[PDB]
Design a protein around this ligand. Structure first.
Ligand SMILES: O=C(NCc1ccccc1)c1cc2c(n1Cc1ccccc1)CN(S(=O)(=O)c1ccccc1F)CC2
Lengths: 12, 224
């Protein structure tokens, strides 16, 4: 769950 | 009276991260060019809301102390503020950003996108009430940070940690009201008035989604 929000949050 | 160097620093970090935002040329060209149909209008709003969630995540990450919070709390704040931040940003664009003739075209599209008048009427009323305050860019940035760093959102593990981050932003905002509008002592109270009015859009939006064209991955996932 929340795979896109997590991806955007953790990038850089 | 003035902001302390510590408050000036906190304000500058918020302002720098807020001013990074820009409406993609691709989306603005669609507002100008795409056919006037309920389907094409709905898709334009979808592209706008998807762009905003990306812009919102980038802004949030840069918020002083946000990165120092528990990872699950970081996600719960993003999820709980997504709808409120969207309406606040949409109010800013309406009262500023978009040109006279170009905003008239976007308003035409919103009023012909399949959204019920039960949701269009409180939305444009909120835009007007925000417009009346003639908010500065500092006020829009701080209000967005206050919305995001809300310690009373559902599923936060360490609420006191979030309170420690939000309290200084409210202190700065109240001080900026006293400095820039010393003749209007109710200015901060009116800003709080827009914050409570923003909270009602959570129910208006959740009801709107329940009425139903599908979603984008950032949309029904951050919107539940
Ligand atoms: O542009 C806007 N308001 C400003 C404005 C207005 C009239 C003239 C000039 C300017 C504006 C208002 C709304 C929505 N938008 C785009 C936007 C702007 C800014 C940030 C995110 C989204 C989208 N939402 S939504 O619930 O997310 C949604 C997503 C997909 C399909 C249908 C939808 F309703 C609806 C309300």
């Amino acid at each position: 769950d929340h795979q896109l929000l997590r991806y955007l949050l953790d990038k850089d | 009276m003035e902001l302390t160097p510590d408050q000036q620093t906190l304000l500058h970090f918020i302002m720098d991260s807020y001013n990074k935002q820009r409406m993609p040329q691709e989306i603005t060209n669609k507002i100008l060019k795409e056919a006037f149909s309920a389907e094409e209008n709905f898709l334009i709003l979808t592209e706008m809301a998807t762009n905003h969630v990306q812009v919102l995540v980038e802004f949030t990450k840069k918020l002083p102390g946000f990165q120092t919070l528990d990872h699950e709390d970081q996600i719960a704040l993003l999820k709980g503020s997504a709808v409120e931040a969207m309406f606040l940003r949409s109010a800013e664009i309406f009262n500023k950003k978009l040109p006279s003739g170009h905003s008239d075209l976007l308003e035409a599209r919103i009023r012909n996108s399949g959204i019920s008048d039960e949701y269009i009427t409180p939305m444009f009323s909120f835009y007007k009430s925000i417009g009346e305050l003639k908010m500065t860019q500092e006020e829009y940035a701080l209000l967005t940070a206050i919305v995001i760093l809300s310690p009373d959102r559902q599923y936060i593990k360490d609420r006191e940690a979030v309170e420690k981050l939000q309290e200084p932003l409210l202190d700065v905002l109240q001080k900026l009201c006293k400095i820039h509008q010393p003749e209007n002592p109710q200015h901060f109270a009116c800003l709080l008035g827009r914050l409570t009015e923003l909270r009602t859009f959570n129910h208006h939006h959740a009801e709107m989604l329940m009425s139903w064209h599908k979603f984008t991955p950032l949309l029904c996932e951050i919107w539940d």
